[PDB]
Design a protein around this ligand. Sequence first.
Ligand code: BY2
Ligand code: NAG
Ligand code: NAG
Length: 527
Amino acid sequence: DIIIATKNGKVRGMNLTVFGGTVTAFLGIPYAQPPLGRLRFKKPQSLTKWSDIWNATKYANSCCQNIDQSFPGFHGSEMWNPNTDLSEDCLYLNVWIPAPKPKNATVLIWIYGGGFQTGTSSLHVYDGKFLARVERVIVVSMNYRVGALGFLALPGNPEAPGNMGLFDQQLALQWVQKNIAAFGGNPKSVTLFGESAGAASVSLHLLSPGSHSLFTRAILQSGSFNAPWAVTSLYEARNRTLNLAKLTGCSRENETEIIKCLRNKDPQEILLNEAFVVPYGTPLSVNFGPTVDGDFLTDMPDILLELGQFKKTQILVGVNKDEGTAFLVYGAPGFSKDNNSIITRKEFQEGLKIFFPGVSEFGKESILFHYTDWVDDQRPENYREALGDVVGDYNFICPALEFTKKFSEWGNNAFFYYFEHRSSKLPWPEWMGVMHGYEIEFVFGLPLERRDNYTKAEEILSRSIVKRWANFAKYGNPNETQNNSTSWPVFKSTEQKYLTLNTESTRIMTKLRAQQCRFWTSFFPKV
Ligand SMILES: CCN(C)C(=O)Oc1ccc(O)c([C@@H](C)N(C)C)c1
Ligand SMILES: *[C@@H]1O[C@H](CO)[C@@H](O)[C@H](O)[C@H]1NC(C)=O
Ligand SMILES: *[C@@H]1O[C@H](CO)[C@@H](O)[C@H](O)[C@H]1NC(C)=O
């Protein structure tokens, strides 16, 4: 038996067998008053004590959210769908502790992605038990509100001030600060790591004064706040709050009345109209996302980055080789997970109109000009590959590199990775390559299960990544020192060295996508 006394009450965990060892799991501890009723759309409120023993022996409810039903019964999509009951009562977190109980263990706090509209901490690929057993770190992860329930913005008005889900994350970080020592954790050695919107969230915690003292270091997997999809403008946040009001018959005068009207709509009705507040959408469409609210975010984040207004600490940042491909089968004409998706020049151009909705004719022509002058003009995959390269560079690689340049220019050590291994078990077709999201299982050490049909090379890659992430969290330096590994140099603004992650050949390279990112970060934002 294992029972820990926390500031708000006692909680009991459960023992798990992992790799001939033991991990102690506390699944579904609450960290806020459930955001129900008059608390919907507001910032999370503190938790009042409890006298009993909270039973933290199963994952809690996922937050209300729309589900991806584009491929029913397909594991490639459905492995990301919520695996616990949806509910507005979803502000819970999980804690994996090594066994026996550590003394001063470094803490890894996971923030899931999902475009700020979906996601849950209970996904199988976020299972922290492997990291706790292998590296003896504590792993925490939390559920935070998503979609309009998490990011509906009327800027200023405290009934719907925006960024509520970010404040959910922040309140969970406070909980670790006040309670993780009871579990054998070091509140002074806390590393946040996160993928996609989770990584963007981590990047925003770096910017947010209220988060400065809640963590030590930061890891950003395939995401950062300067990604095109990551921050809703206050203009469109307003148009979107108003549009959602009209679709639900909640249009009012007194802006607060709109909120009270939405506070009596059913979660499902809010959810089903969320989709329509933008004209057309893709998973890169982030209808309700982070906003400049004057509270969590005191100014436009691009300005805070430019001017060094952020927490000074080490960062680990990276991207996958084919970030873009996954999104093409959610709208790009002529793509499918079930053919090899040879598209034509005209399908390519149609694809641009979907991924760059309000961009001028000339904007789209400059994209095609830069990406469609080939070596062999006859290679049938030309346009298929270029559209994936366009989406990934624009949405992921160039923002990640831009964030890492600007962040490192203020003196801090930064390490950049380029994840190049396609999972042997990957259920999506070969043409999508090293997909967005499919480094996560290697980070969480799933391939360390020999029982699980991962190749032996994948076990080694995971073992190394896990050691580098842990050493980064413990020591600020993502090196694997024993097994004679390539040393991971710091990313500096002149040489821009980065580390490739693969089963074959761990190489040091420089100036990832130099040509393409000059297009995207220098020229394109003017159009
Ligand atoms: C908000 C509407 N819905 C349900 C949605 O956006 O679901 C997502 C979100 C992120 C995402 O990356 C993906 C695809 C490309 N991944 C392979 C999981 C689907
Ligand atoms: C917690 O779980 C144990 C199972 O051993 C049970 O005896 C106890 O009643 C549970 N407590 C609550 C509050 O459900
Ligand atoms: C854990 O680390 C902190 C860092 O200063 C230190 O104060 C403390 O003594 C360490 N050990 C324990 C058991 O808290």
